[PDB]
Amino acid sequence: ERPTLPIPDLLTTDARNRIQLTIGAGQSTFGGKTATTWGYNGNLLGPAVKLQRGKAVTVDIYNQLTEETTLHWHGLEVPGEVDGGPQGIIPPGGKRSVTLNVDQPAATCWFHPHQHGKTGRQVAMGLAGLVVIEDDEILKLMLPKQWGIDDVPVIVQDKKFSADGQIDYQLDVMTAAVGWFGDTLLTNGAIYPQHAAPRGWLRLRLLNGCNARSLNFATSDNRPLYVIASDGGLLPEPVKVSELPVLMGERFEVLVEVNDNKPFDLVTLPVSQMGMAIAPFDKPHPVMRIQPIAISASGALPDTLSSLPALPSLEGLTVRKLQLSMDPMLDMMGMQMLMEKYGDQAMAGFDFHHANKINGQAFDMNKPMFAAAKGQYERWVISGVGDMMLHPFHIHGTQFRILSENGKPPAAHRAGWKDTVKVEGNVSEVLVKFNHDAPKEHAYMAHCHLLEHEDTGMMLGFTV
Ligand SMILES: [Cu+2]
Ligand SMILES: [Cu+2]
């Protein structure tokens, strides 16, 4: 389709090693209809902050909203002081600065709000940005690297809009149970955009930034995707796939071939997740149109990308159980509202504000559930046995290794560095290590990244 894919600005440090982000309301147009939206350095979404491993930057964050917000760097291994969870309040009109010393490998991470009880609304209203972490190793690989030509961020999100055009967000009994999801699919903000890519290798940095909707990327003509990276960065070698399931807040980088003059789309396939299979997501849905052009691209697909550390021996490692639950009365009413609204289509494949839980407790921001060890591998066992909802479980402060994802060894493209693991009626195990500290006043969060679950209790705080 006609409008070109918007390309987030690649924001680097200035002469004082500073970067400025302004958080503001603005306006966007979706299918001819204007809507109030929120953005970083803009009306909608945000820039791609570019960082170099081992080099420090100060970020000056200005809240130009009229409500409180927080700024979290999802995927970044930083102290709890700069991590920007629910306790990282930036008052409206106020300025807060954080020093980040990046000490992890090349990876596409991202940033987004983490306001207590309202994170779902603030992301839905428009707030997300990328983080391009670079190191010495990755630049040696000669991957596609022309930002916005053959190296393009692709941030995919759904939205629901009112008859008047305004984003129609609500945290109610239905969305607390099944999540906020919509009928309009957005790609860097645009409805079904087009991208001119040169012949050879196209590098796509995929981010699922939907609140609650899982995706599954493929191509319309079924040309393969070569996955080169996960949440925490480079896989050891490429993993070649026909389709790519992505959970809320997960990133993958893929190279895809642009070989003839023939256009093709990037698409998302229907998922079996409650609520998410209603038309138009009952069939393959286009994400963006790739349009070959002949201009110069020398990007490469290496045989060998990186070498990752080995999984540690499990013996002696501390084990932490995290039992995710939902009040069954939220479950019921939730699925009933869903049934009322949409009907049988919804199934293709009491304060509800504290109804979602971990270890029998809705998130309390004052009482960290535990102190985790520093610089020592632990094994966390996260169970969703007891309900049928999807829970992409996420841990701040870390890139971990999945030992077991929902009852099975992880797929090859998911066995490298991840910050999210799937939990859905089964149990997952991960090998977590924290290299930085987080006091109780600025605790790390562990939580479901189905944002409406997070906002109604499915989060805990922990210290290091
Ligand atoms: Cu995070
Ligand atoms: Cu959940």
Swiss-Prot record:
Its cofactor is Cu cation. One of its GO terms (biological process) is detoxification of copper ion. Triggering CueO activity at need by the addition of copper salts with minor toxic effects on E.coli cells could be used as a simple tool for biosynthetic purposes. The protein was also identified as robust host protein for use in biosensing and drug-screening applications. SUPFAM superfamilies: Cupredoxins. Multicopper oxidase involved in copper homeostasis and copper tolerance under aerobic conditions. Is responsible for the oxidation of Cu(+) to the less harmful Cu(2+) in the periplasm, thereby preventing Cu(+) from entering the cytoplasm. Probably primarily functions as a cuprous oxidase in vivo. Changing residue 77 to F: Increases oxidase activity with ABTS as substrate. The keyword Repeat applies. Binds 4 Cu cations per monomer. Contains a mononuclear type 1 (T1) or 'blue' copper site, and a trinuclear copper center consisting of one type 2 (T2) or 'normal' copper site, and two type 3 (T3) or 'binuclear' copper sites. Changing residue 387 to A: Decrease in oxidase activity with 2,6-DMP as substrate. One of its GO terms (cellular component) is outer membrane-bounded periplasmic space. This is Multicopper oxidase CueO. Keywords: Copper, Metal-binding, Oxidoreductase, Periplasm, Repeat, Signal. Optimum temperature is 55 degrees Celsius with 2,6-DMP as substrate. CDD domains: CuRO_1_CueO_FtsP (cd04232), CuRO_2_CueO_FtsP (cd13867), CuRO_3_CueO_FtsP (cd13890). GO terms for molecular function: copper ion binding; ferroxidase activity; oxidoreductase activity, acting on diphenols and related substances as donors, oxygen as acceptor; oxidoreductase activity, acting on metal ions; oxidoreductase activity, acting on metal ions, oxygen as acceptor. Its EC number is 1.16.3.4. Residues 26-136, 198-263, 350-464 form the Plastocyanin-like domain. Monomer.
